[PDB]
Amino acid sequence: VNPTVFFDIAVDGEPLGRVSFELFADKVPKTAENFRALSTGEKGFGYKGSCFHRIIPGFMCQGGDFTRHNGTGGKSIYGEKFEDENFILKHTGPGILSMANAGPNTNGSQFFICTAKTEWLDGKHVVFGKVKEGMNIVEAMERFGSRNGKTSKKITIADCGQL
Amino acid sequence: SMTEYKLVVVGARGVGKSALTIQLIQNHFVDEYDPTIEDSYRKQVVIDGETCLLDILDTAGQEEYSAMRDQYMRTGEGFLCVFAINNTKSFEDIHHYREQIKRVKDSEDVPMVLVGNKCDLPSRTVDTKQAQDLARSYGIPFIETSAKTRQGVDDAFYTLVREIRKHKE
């Protein structure tokens, strides 16, 4: 059975609401497990306290840099980077959860939640989950974004874990 | 009052487009790689005694969006065509950027400067003479730079302003 994790989202420190995700361990076990463990913090590091550093209305919200907190960092539970597990699943619409990277086989911890279909990223980014509950929170987040991604307020993962 | 110049920085992923620009604007360099969506900056400078305002567009090297460059190329007045001296593929990409700019502006006479960046590094794979020959064939200046040491950073942007002035007379 696929794990479920949650993010408690805050905006300049004030709570907004909870987003939960189904992680497709049945198709991408290695990628789902990285995101699961980073959500629990069980390796002694992970998503708690980090920001959504890039939000572009009509496209996606991206976050997960808990090592440098500036959009350039992050690391997996397997080392700094790990390989593209597979590209079975596609960027079919809003709510898809998928790995950010800097080219082939550079998965770390950064990820992005789609707010629209982004099919041109198929075969380049590993899809590994989707929003289960709280898609309205992700939509609420979009108005803090902009054309180039800079956010006008600090959007943070105040708490996270496994359900 | 002072003339505004619309500079556009183009080139392959990771060649130093943003590091050159941030050195110009903020006088510092970081080794981390923050890949660009699109950024814009303003700075006033003095070039050949004349004060002017630089409007700088820092563009994405991401190749998947090559079809989305037309509007910023129409708007721009001059182009820093940046490659990295340790990255032969970025030097080869220069020709495709230059052809796109000429095609989009429908002119053989567009202000441009060839920039070979990361000249602080020892792993050079593009000879200086190889870049100067290309620039000579294009009829544009070639300037070597390092964003890390600041070598040539002012010179590259200022030379492009001089090219734009010559174009407008």
Ligand SMILES: CCn1c(-c2cc(N3CCN(C)CC3)cnc2[C@H](C)OC)c2c3cc(ccc31)-c1csc(n1)C[C@H](NC(=O)[C@H]1C[C@@H]1C)C(=O)N1CCC[C@H](N1)C(=O)OCC(C)(C)C2
């Ligand atoms: C041309 C302008 N542009 C655009 C773009 C594209 C369109 N289209 C319209 C027509 N349709 C059919 C095609 C697309 C329209 N409007 C714009 C924007 C709004 O014009 C300003 C994008 C983009 C992405 C990058 C650079 C320039 C870019 C880029 C730069 S690094 C990158 N991608 C990949 C990025 N790595 C990282 O962060 C590394 C550091 C970490 C480890 C990454 O893993 N992720 C996750 C997936 C999404 C991606 N970030 C991102 O942010 O995508 C932004 C998006 C808007 C979705 C695409």
Ligand SMILES: Nc1nc2c(ncn2[C@@H]2O[C@H](COP(=O)(O)OP(=O)(O)NP(=O)(O)O)[C@@H](O)[C@H]2O)c(=O)[nH]1
């Ligand atoms: N040694 C050295 N490293 C440099 C130099 N210029 C940039 N770099 C490094 O090369 C990497 C890429 O630089 P960046 O400015 O982000 O390149 P870009 O062309 O703007 N990339 P993109 O097109 O994705 O936006 C960074 O790690 C940066 O520190 C330079 O002159 N010397």
Ligand SMILES: [Mg+2]
């Ligand atoms: Mg850049």
